[PDB]
Every structure is written in structure tokens, then in C-alpha cells.
Amino acid sequence: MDVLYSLSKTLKDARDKIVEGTLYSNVSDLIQQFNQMIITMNGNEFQTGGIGNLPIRNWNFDFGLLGTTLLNLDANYVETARNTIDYFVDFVDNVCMDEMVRESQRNGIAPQSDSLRKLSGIKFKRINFDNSSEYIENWNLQNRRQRTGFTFHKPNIFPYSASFTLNRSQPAHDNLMGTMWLNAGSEIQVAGFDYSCAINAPANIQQFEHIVQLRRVLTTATITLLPDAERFSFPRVINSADGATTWYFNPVILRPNNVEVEFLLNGQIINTYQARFGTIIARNFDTIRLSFQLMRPPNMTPAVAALFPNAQPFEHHATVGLTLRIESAVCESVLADASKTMLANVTSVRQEYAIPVGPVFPPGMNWTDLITNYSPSREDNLQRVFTVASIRSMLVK
Amino acid sequence: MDVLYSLSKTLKDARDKIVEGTLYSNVSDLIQQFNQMIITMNGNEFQTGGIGNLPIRNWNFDFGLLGTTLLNLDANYVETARNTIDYFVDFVDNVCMDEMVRESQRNGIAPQSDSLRKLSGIKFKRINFDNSSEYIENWNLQNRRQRTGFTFHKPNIFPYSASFTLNRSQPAHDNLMGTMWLNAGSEIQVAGFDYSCAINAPANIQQFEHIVQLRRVLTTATITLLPDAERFSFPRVINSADGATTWYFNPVILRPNNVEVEFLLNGQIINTYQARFGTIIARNFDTIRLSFQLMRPPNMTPAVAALFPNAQPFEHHATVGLTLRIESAVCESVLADASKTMLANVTSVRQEYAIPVGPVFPPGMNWTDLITNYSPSREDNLQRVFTVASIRSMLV
Amino acid sequence: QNYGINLPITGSMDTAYANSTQEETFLTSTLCLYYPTEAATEINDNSWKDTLSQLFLTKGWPTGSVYFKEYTDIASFSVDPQLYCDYNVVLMKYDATLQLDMSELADLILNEWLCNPMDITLYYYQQTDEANKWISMGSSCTIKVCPLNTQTLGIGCLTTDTATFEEVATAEKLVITDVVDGVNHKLDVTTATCTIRNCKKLGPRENVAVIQVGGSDVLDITADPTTAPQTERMMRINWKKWWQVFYTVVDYVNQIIQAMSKRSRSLNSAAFYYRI
Amino acid sequence: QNYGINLPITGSMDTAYANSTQEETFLTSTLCLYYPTEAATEINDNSWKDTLSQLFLTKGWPTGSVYFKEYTDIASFSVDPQLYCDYNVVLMKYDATLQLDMSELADLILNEWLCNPMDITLYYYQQTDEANKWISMGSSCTIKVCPLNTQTLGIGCLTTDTATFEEVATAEKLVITDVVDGVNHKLDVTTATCTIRNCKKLGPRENVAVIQVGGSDVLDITADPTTAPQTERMMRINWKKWWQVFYTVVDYVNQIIQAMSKRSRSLNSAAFYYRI
Numbered sequence A: 001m002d003v004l005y006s007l008s009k010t011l012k013d014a015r016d017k018i019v020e021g022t023l024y025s026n027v028s029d030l031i032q033q034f035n036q037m038i039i040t041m042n043g044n045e046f047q048t049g050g051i052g053n054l055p056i057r058n059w060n061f062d063f064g065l066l067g068t069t070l071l072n073l074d075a076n077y078v079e080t081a082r083n084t085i086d087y088f089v090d091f092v093d094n095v096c097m098d099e100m101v102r103e104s105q106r107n108g109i110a111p112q113s114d115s116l117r118k119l120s121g122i123k124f125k126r127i128n129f130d131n132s133s134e135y136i137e138n139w140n141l142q143n144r145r146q147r148t149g150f151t152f153h154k155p156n157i158f159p160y161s162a163s164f165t166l167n168r169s170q171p172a173h174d175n176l177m178g179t180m181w182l183n184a185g186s187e188i189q190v191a192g193f194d195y196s197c198a199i200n201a202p203a204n205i206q207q208f209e210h211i212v213q214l215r216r217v218l219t220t221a222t223i224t225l226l227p228d229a230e231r232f233s234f235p236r237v238i239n240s241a242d243g244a245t246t247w248y249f250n251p252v253i254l255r256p257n258n259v260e261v262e263f264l265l266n267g268q269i270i271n272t273y274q275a276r277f278g279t280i281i282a283r284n285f286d287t288i289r290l291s292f293q294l295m296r297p298p299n300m301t302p303a304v305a306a307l308f309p310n311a312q313p314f315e316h317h318a319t320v321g322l323t324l325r326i327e328s329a330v331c332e333s334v335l336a337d338a339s340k341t342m343l344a345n346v347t348s349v350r351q352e353y354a355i356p357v358g359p360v361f362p363p364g365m366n367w368t369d370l371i372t373n374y375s376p377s378r379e380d381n382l383q384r385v386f387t388v389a390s391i392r393s394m395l396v397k
Numbered sequence B: 001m002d003v004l005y006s007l008s009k010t011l012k013d014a015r016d017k018i019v020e021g022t023l024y025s026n027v028s029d030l031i032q033q034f035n036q037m038i039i040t041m042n043g044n045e046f047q048t049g050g051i052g053n054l055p056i057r058n059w060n061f062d063f064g065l066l067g068t069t070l071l072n073l074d075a076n077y078v079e080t081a082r083n084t085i086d087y088f089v090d091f092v093d094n095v096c097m098d099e100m101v102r103e104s105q106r107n108g109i110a111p112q113s114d115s116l117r118k119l120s121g122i123k124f125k126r127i128n129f130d131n132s133s134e135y136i137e138n139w140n141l142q143n144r145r146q147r148t149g150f151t152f153h154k155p156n157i158f159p160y161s162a163s164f165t166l167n168r169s170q171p172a173h174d175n176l177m178g179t180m181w182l183n184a185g186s187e188i189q190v191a192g193f194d195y196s197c198a199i200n201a202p203a204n205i206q207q208f209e210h211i212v213q214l215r216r217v218l219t220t221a222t223i224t225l226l227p228d229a230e231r232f233s234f235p236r237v238i239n240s241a242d243g244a245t246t247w248y249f250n251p252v253i254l255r256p257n258n259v260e261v262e263f264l265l266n267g268q269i270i271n272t273y274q275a276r277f278g279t280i281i282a283r284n285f286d287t288i289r290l291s292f293q294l295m296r297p298p299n300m301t302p303a304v305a306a307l308f309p310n311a312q313p314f315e316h317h318a319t320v321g322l323t324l325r326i327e328s329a330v331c332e333s334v335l336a337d338a339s340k341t342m343l344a345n346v347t348s349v350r351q352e353y354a355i356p357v358g359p360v361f362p363p364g365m366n367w368t369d370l371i372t373n374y375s376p377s378r379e380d381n382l383q384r385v386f387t388v389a390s391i392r393s394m395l396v
Numbered sequence C, D: 001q002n003y004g005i006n007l008p009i010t011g012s013m014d015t016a017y018a019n020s021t022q023e024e025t026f027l028t029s030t031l032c033l034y035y036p037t038e039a040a041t042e043i044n045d046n047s048w049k050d051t052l053s054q055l056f057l058t059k060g061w062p063t064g065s066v067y068f069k070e071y072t073d074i075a076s077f078s079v080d081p082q083l084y085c086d087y088n089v090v091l092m093k094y095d096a097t098l099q100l101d102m103s104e105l106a107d108l109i110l111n112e113w114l115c116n117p118m119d120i121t122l123y124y125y126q127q128t129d130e131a132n133k134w135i136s137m138g139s140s141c142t143i144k145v146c147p148l149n150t151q152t153l154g155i156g157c158l159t160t161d162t163a164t165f166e167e168v169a170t171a172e173k174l175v176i177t178d179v180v181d182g183v184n185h186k187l188d189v190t191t192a193t194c195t196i197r198n199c200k201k202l203g204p205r206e207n208v209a210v211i212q213v214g215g216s217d218v219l220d221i222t223a224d225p226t227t228a229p230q231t232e233r234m235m236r237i238n239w240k241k242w243w244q245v246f247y248t249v250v251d252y253v254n255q256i257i258q259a260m261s262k263r264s265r266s267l268n269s270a271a272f273y274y275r276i
């Protein structure tokens, strides 16, 4: 991995820095690195790609070294360098694609393609140099089992889940008390609905609770908490838990009462926020407990009083929402997020070449399936393919 | 950890090999390693801690080297070696005890005692040699980010749990359909009971499903599947879910029907066994799903036909049971089992010295609570203390 | 059930709808049509029940599933009404002079009730909450009320002179009395001909619909003056000939049953649960 | 709360028993005692209700909660029996010539029945399954049946001539009729003075106990000839004096109520299954 990353890093530096007219003193170290790469790779045969529709490509390296006598780079120098760079970039692209379309149950963190296995040998370790990208840096830290950190803008930490719980219900579905939530990506929208508006509740308070268990621990998380849930604030016709019939939801939104956000780690309270809306910080947690009350307003203007009668039929159902958005967080495992392209690149390569379903990943790289059952073997394979995808993105993209 | 293990292994080898009359060539490499250990330890002060009732102990090393020039070891040689060995064994045992009674939440795999942190310094790396035991080998492989596994005979993977689910019930508890189960250690005993014997069921079949979600993945697991559950095959008076009243269970055991045992990983079926009993192999799974059916016997002799009337009262309750015993398995993480003493050793040391409850383990190192909430921090601390307990077991 | 009543129901908002359950519902349920005797008089036929059953049979109801129970008029039908079938459709004739009575019948039929015995001779009584009413039924109820105070002396009444009691009902076959809550009332009722019970309104009765034949919307099934709700089970049809009424009932039986549920039919046919 | 659905309940063994709840139920439950008139006659003491109430008070029940309901004889009590107390205990005197009638009464009150209305003048009736019976009660219920074939012609009877109908009940006060299943039967019933209903035996009624006074094991509360179950709620007592019988009933009331349970079909959990 470090060798593949170093190859790609050298090639990217060469593309960016070996430019017409530049002082040789701008590239001397890069020229030495490029020549060391050429020397190490010369005389080695590689084969990439025998899975799915990925073609078998054979790679031979017999290149001359870049010169070192110039004081400024001229056009011919840059063109010969570009020829060598193009061949190497094609090779590195193919090696990355070959590694990305493979998985292993046993040592998913280890190389799977034969070319990367060969690049793991001692002779190639000379190529290794500056490992400064976040993914390769995390890779090297994880090899030594040092504390890793991946920064995610809008981490895709919640598998898609749009469901409801009914605490009070009956076959007519006209006096319903419960909760409905969409947990999707980096967002939790939840809403507690009482059809009676807590008319016969103990002191006119209806307590709602929602527990979200993250499959990985998040640290240093900026989170927006907004009082309302726009997703559960309009009329809906909803299937029953068995799917036999359909019930009606005609919500009227009241501000949630005694809102309490709890961020917990291993079932222990880490952060507690009471009546706090806007930006909050959850420093280290794996579970979110949102508790919030529907408080029947003691005083009502005539329209409000007409909304909520003393008894059934209840036409306007008292609903209190909450919206929770993880803006940015840190996780010790790789994750899909809104800003990066690692998952999209891995999925795109796997789909472009019709990679058959393997024993590790879901039937097509569905993120919901992966994150729902984010097992250690899956984590190892995903970190490997994501590091390879970033290495590829340094050059192909 | 590697250094502590090397110290212990050196001492164990010296005890086993430095014996009267033995050829020096039998022990020459061991004597070189022992002298290297002495050289590396000489001039260092150690303090084993005062946590709990474990006393504060100070350790000093000013030992001479063992001889190298005899053809055969003699009685003088053995006595001289034993004097140094006893002190080193006492020191290693105290370091192991000091490390076994400590825990950390942030970094539970790293050493906790001062002595083991001092021994992790580069100046002691010379002591390190053959790391051949399963626990230290796993430790090194895991530090190398390498796939390694602990082998367990009768792994204690299931938290103790004796419970029941009633899918059909009434306040009088006389027409009950449901499941009874004991998950204990490496054993699962499940039983579906129908009081009406599926008289009024579609096709005269009652379906039972029991899912056990293992807290860690198991691999290459040898399992015995037996078609009955003797734990739920005799009359019982059982509390109700709230304990308000007690109901009556009067089993009559029928052969379970359509027995399907699935071993699943990440929600996907890895192994499936249909109507198979005896030895089966679950190659890699985190969940066990047991489906079985109480099938009303289409033909019944009069003695059988009496036991199952068309309607209530139901006196003989038709029960079908399965039993699943994990004989052997492999786990990435550490676990208690019927063979190894790591858990017992750690618990014993924690009990003898009145070690208070820490922020990692449950009080008393109780295994049910520990395995129920097997968090990563708990896993790290527990592998650390188990490796230290094995290292201590080499000498104590 | 009872050991799982207070447990949550979790449902996904992506589960597939089941097929139509109307066929199974009609094949396995009973339908009772309650009509006024004047209806059968106007029909004048003695086999019209058979014809209606046959016409229902085209709507999926098996033969011995629809039932026709006759009642004289609103007043008599209100004397301890009994609801027999899985679905009960009460064809009630409208009368401007019996509005409240109709409402009371509706209130007793479209809502579920839980009633305890009342002994008006040996005890004073009060209505605890807005759901607590006094429902009395029989040949003729004449309810007179004397409100008391904390000292248990009457207000505008004398505990010994019943002539000073405030009258709230006279010659009633069914009356629901709502008095001021938290006040002990001495009660005078003609217990010989009718019985009074302290009732609590639990909730709707989903298996009984009331079709008002003729008139306008006058039903008021809630004592509260600020609400006069018209539920899905309270229908109204303009009419000139009873055959047309029965035909519109039969043809749109699907719409009628959609407004009802088959989860309120109790073991007994009484319009109220009774506890001692 | 989740009333219309049966959610499975998970219980743990080793969950501690709650304390005895017998005192609380005695303090919050009503005990109706049913006895024949001859019992009151032989006792011959107009104050015996007060004495029994005080004895029950000694045994736990508050002295306003035990009820005594008198019936004339087994046959009369079987007409529309109504057991409204939390716990009902029937002292049923034994007669060697009334074995079937005692069995019918016990079957009617020891088990829960869901009865649909029967219109024998409108429909041919058939019994679907072994739980489906025809229960008829009244001052005098005489029932004759004509079993029909697939072509609707009668078998051993003529639909037009009722005199040929096979007679299954004569001048009965209560009769549970069980015929072959799946065969349509035309019914001739003296509907003028007795009601017949198509009933299903849902299950036991656990709040009603019957003590057979001075007989033998004869009750058959199940129509299956191969089963004659003796449930815990059908006791038997030898007697010479009714005072000793009442004294035994009071002294062993703990045991009696132990053999019973709160009516499962009753109470809020049963809501939306059949009743409350």
C-alpha cells in the first residue's frame, strides 16, 4: 500500500513539477525519487486484472532515467518524462482498480491483487517516500495500531431507516400515540405524535424517547439540533406494522418540551444538552438518546381549543419533532461522507467491470447493508479499498 | 508484554533445564539468554504497586552471571542458579499481579502498571526472545495487524440467560404457545411449546424461531446438534413475565419438525443444516438461527390421541426441543472456556487483594455481565489481563 | 395479548400493502340491519328479507350472514338496545320532536360505555369527570335531582321533600343525565319501571353505524356543547320510498363497512359493559 | 395501549415472585354467591345474609362486596343467566334426572360463548366446526331439525312438513344442540317463547365456579363423547344442611377463588378482541 501510494505520489509530483522552463533545483529531489522508482521497477513483469470484466493487462518496465545535467527543463525533457509518466500512471490505475475489486474474509487489510502483493516485497520498499495524505497516514498509523482519525463532513453513519413505533394503538387507528423517524445518512428526523394531545395523560405530558445506536464511535462531532421535524409534519397515509391496513396522520406541530439530547459511550453519559438548539458538540459517543415531551398547552385561543377536544374523534394530532444533523465528525474507521468520493469510486469500478458478489461486501456495495453490519472484516476490507481508491484518485481523477 | 513474557519464559526454561548432571550444551542457549536478562535488569529499581491490598514491593537487581564453562551442571551450579531464579520469579509474579488488577478505558491494551511500562522501554528490548505461546503469539500478531485466532474448547460465548417468550397467552396460562430457552456458556437448549398441540393451526404446524446473536464472530466451530432439550422436558411451575403469578408447564416431547439451523454472518446465511443431528461445522458466523416446527402427528394411537383433545382443557403440552453444544471454535477476541484458567486466575487475583471495581470490568469480573456488554475497551483490557495471566501461569 | 398490551408496535414505512381484505371480511362476518317497523309496513311484503339477503349475496356476503332486526320506533328501541352482529347498521327515522332522543340513542350506540349499579335510595351520587354520565333505561324514567353542598344540605331542594327536586327527565325510555361534577346529588327515579346506572364513556363503538333516514344533521353524541362531531359512522340519506333506502344500503354496503371495524363486537349484545 | 394486536411477551426465569395479591383482590373484587331457594328455606333466618357478610369480612372480603343472588331451580336459572360479579360461585343442587340439564347449564356458564343471531325462518343453518353449537334458551324451547343434502331436499324429513322433523329439544329452558357438521339443517323452533343462537365456544370462563351439591361426577361440558374433563372450577360437595355448605364455602373461599381467575374476556386488555 505504501509502495503503491508512493508510486502514485511520485507520478503526481512529476506531473505537477516537471514542467517546461522550471529550475532543475525545483525538481532535483523529485528527479532522484523518480529515477529510484524507474530503477526499482525496471526488469519487473506485472499482471493486473482477471476478475469480472477487468481485462488481463501485462506490464513491462524498461525505461531510461531522466537526465540531471540541465539547469532549466526544456520541452524535450518534459516530453520524455511525460511518456514515462503516462505509462506509469496507466499501470498504477490498473493496479488500483485490480485491488479495489477484490476482498478477503481472512486478511482483508492485506493486499489481494497479485501486483500489489509483488509490490509488497522488500526490493520495492526503496520506492517508499512521503506518506502525507490523510488516508495513507491513517493506514500507516493503523498498521502500528496507533490512534487513527478520519474527518468526515456529514458522515454516512446512519443506515437508511424510515419506520414508526406505536405505543398506543388499536385497529381503527384514530387514537394513536407513538414515534416516527427517518434515520438517513448523517440525519435523524424524529417525531412523537399523540392523537389525544395528552388530554388524559398524567399531568398532560406525553414523554417520547428515541435511541439511535451508531455502528462506530464518533468523536469531535459538530451537530445541529433543530426543534421541528419537517419530514413528519404533513398529512400522511401510513401502512400498518403488519401491512394489513392503512392509517391516517393529520399532524399539528407543537414545540417539543423538555428536549434532552444525550450522547453516550458504552452506555455512559458523555454529553447532555437540555433545551439547547443550534450547534452543539458531542466529543465522544456511540449512542444518541433523544427524549422530548409533548406538553398540552394550558391556555388555548379558541381555534387551538377547537383543535384538541376532550375526547374522540381526534382530527388534529399533536406532534412534536426534532431534527439532528451531524455536520462534521471524526471516526477511527473509514466511512462514506458527503464530500469524498472513495465509496463512489469503489462502487463505480466494481459496477463498471461487473465484479461478482464476494464473501465480504453486500451484493453490490450498498452502503445501508454495509453500515448496518459493519463488521471488523468488512472494516478492514473497506479501509483497504478506500485507501486504494484515494491513491487512484490522486492520478486518475 | 513481550518482555514480561520473555522474562517468564526464561525463568520457566531455567527451572526446567538447569538440573543436576545435565550437559551444558543442553542449556547453553538458555544460559546465554539468562545472562542477557541479568545484564539488562542489573541496576534497575522496580516498584510493584499498592493497589487494593496488594502490598507495595521494591525490587533491586545486582545479580552475577551464571557460569558457562562446565561440561555437566553440578549441585553447586543448580543452587547458585536457583537463588537468582527465585528472586526473578517473585518479581515477575508481582509484576503480573500488578498488571492483572488494573484497567483503563482510553487505552486498555497498553500496559497499566509502572513496572510493565518501564519494561516496555527500549533498554529492556534485549530480554525479548522466543514468543511461542498462543496468547503471546496472538498478542504479537495483533500488534502487527495480522489475522490471529484463539482456539477454545467449549467457548463461553453465550451470556447466561434462562427466559421464555409467550406468543399466545392468557391470564390463566392454560393455552400457551411460545418458546423456552437456556443460553449458557457454549450450550443452547431451546424448546417450543404449544398447549393445543397445533389443533387449530394452519396445516396443523406450529413454527418456532430462536435467534442467538453472538457478541463475537466464531470460526471453524464444531457443534453437536441434538433433537431434544432435556432442560424443558419435565413439569415446571414458572413465574410470569412480571412475576405476578405462576403458570404450569406439563411437557410431552414430540420430534421437532423442519429443523433448520442457520449460521449467519452479517445477516447472510453461511451454513445451513436441515434435519441434521450430530456433528456439524459452522465455518464462520456471528448468529445462530434455529427454526423448528411442532407438527401434529396425523395418526395417533388411542393413548396418544387422548393426550391432545380438540379443545381445552389441555393437560399435556406438546413440546419440541433442540440442543446446540459448541464443542470447539476459534475467535479473534479472547474468551473464557472450559479448559483455560485465564479468567479464573484474573478473578482469583482480583478477589485475593480486594481490588475495587474499575471503570472497565463489572464487579467481581463476572463473566455474564462481561460477555453481555463486550465493548472494545473491555476487549482490550481483557486480552491484556488474560495474556498477563497466562504469563503468570507459566511460573505460578 | 394482555401480557403484551403494553408493548410497542414497530412498523416500517416501506412494508408492502396486503391485498383486499373485503372478501374475507364479508365471508366471515355477520351483518345486522336494524330498521323501524314502519319500514316493513311500507314495504308490505313478507319475503323482502329474502330478497335483501339475495341482493347482498351479490356483494359477497354469504347467505346466512345478513340479519334484519325490527324495532318499533326510536323510544322503544332505546330500552336496553342489543347489538347482535359483527356489523350493525341502524336505519333510524328522523323526527323533529325526538332529536335529543335520537342523539341519546346514537350516544348509547356509537360509543362504548362501562356502567356500575346506582342505588339512588341509600346513597348520594356525583359525576366525577366529563366521561361520567348517568344512563337510565326502562319503561318510563322520571329523573329528579337535588344538588347538595359540602354539608349535604340541598341547594334549591329539600332532602325530605322530593317535590322540590329539580326534574331532568319525564317518561323517558332512555335518558343520559349529565349533572355538575363534584356535587353530591340526591336522586329520585321511578326505579319500579326503569333502572339507572353510573356509566363512563370509554370510546367509540366502531362496529355500529347509524344511517339517519331523512331530515338533516341533528345528532349530538357528545354532551359537550362546544363540539358536535359527525363521524364516519353517522350517515344521512334523503328518502321517499323505503325500498330505495334498502337498495342504497345494500349497494353501498362496501362504503358502510369501510367506515366500521369488526373489533368492537363484544361477547354479549348489550350496548354497555356492566360491572358490579 | 396496543389493544388490537397480540404482541409476544418475553419473560425471564429467576424473576422474583411478587407478594401474595389475595388480600388486594378480596378488597377490590365482588363475589356473587348463587344458591337455590330451598337453601334459603332450610336455613330459615332472615338475617343470614348479614352473618355471611360478616364471616366473609373475617375471611377478607369487605362487608359490601359479597353478593347473594337467589334462583328457583336449575331449569329456571338457565334462562338468560347473568353473572356480573368479578367472581361468581353457583351452588347447583344435583338431581339424577337432570344430568343433561346440569351439564348444559355448566357448559353455558363455565365456558365463553360468542353467539350470532339465528333466523330459522330466513336461512338454513349449518354447524361449521366442532366448536360451533346452537344454544337456545327461553320459557319453553322445542327444537326439531331436518338435515338437508346437497340438492336442498331433506333426508328422512320433508322441508314442507315439519311433523317429520327430527326432534332434538322438547319444552327446554336451555338446550345446546350439536348436529353433524357441514350439513345444512332446516330448523323448526318455537321462536315465540324461546331464542336460538348460533354460538362458538371460544374457551373457558374462568371467573365462574360451580359446586355440585350432593351428587356424583356427571357434568359433561364438552360435546365430544371421548372427553369428560373435570376442570378445577367444577367442585362437588356432600351435604345434609345448607348451613354447613355455606360454612364450607366461606371457610375455603381462598381455595375457591384460587381455582378461578379474572374474566380474561373482560378487563381493558381484552379491548378490541371481543369485549372491553
Ligand SMILES: *[C@@H]1O[C@H](CO)[C@@H](O)[C@H](O)[C@H]1NC(C)=O
Binding pocket: C019
Ligand atoms: C395478492 O394478490 C396478488 C395479485 O393478485 C397475488 O399474486 C398474491 O398471491 C395475493 N396474495 C398475497 C398474499 O400477496
Ligand SMILES: *[C@@H]1O[C@H](CO)[C@@H](O)[C@H](O)[C@H]1NC(C)=O
Binding pocket: D019
Ligand atoms: C412484600 O413482602 C416483603 C416480605 O414480607 C416485604 O418486605 C415487602 O415490603 C412487601 N411488599 C412489596 C410491595 O414487595
Ligand SMILES: [Ca+2]
Binding pocket: C156, C157, C163, C164, C165, C166
Ligand atoms: Ca327546588
Ligand SMILES: [Ca+2]
Binding pocket: C100, C101, C104, C172, C173, C174, C175, C176
Ligand atoms: Ca330521552
Ligand SMILES: [Ca+2]
Binding pocket: C127, C129, C130, C132, C178, C179, C180, C181
Ligand atoms: Ca357531569
Ligand SMILES: [Ca+2]
Binding pocket: C220, C221, C222, C223, C224, C225, C226, C227, C228, C229
Ligand atoms: Ca355536543
Ligand SMILES: [Ca+2]
Binding pocket: D100, D101, D104, D172, D173, D174, D175
Ligand atoms: Ca335442557
Ligand SMILES: [Ca+2]
Binding pocket: D156, D157, D164, D165, D166
Ligand atoms: Ca322424520
Ligand SMILES: [Ca+2]
Binding pocket: D127, D129, D130, D132, D178, D179, D180, D181
Ligand atoms: Ca356439529
Ligand SMILES: [Ca+2]
Binding pocket: D220, D221, D222, D223, D224, D225, D226, D227, D228
Ligand atoms: Ca363429553
Ligand SMILES: [Zn+2]
Binding pocket: A166, A169, A173, A239, A240, A241, A247
Ligand atoms: Zn397499526
Ligand SMILES: [Zn+2]
Binding pocket: B166, B169, B173, B239, B240, B241, B247, C003, D011
Ligand atoms: Zn405469563
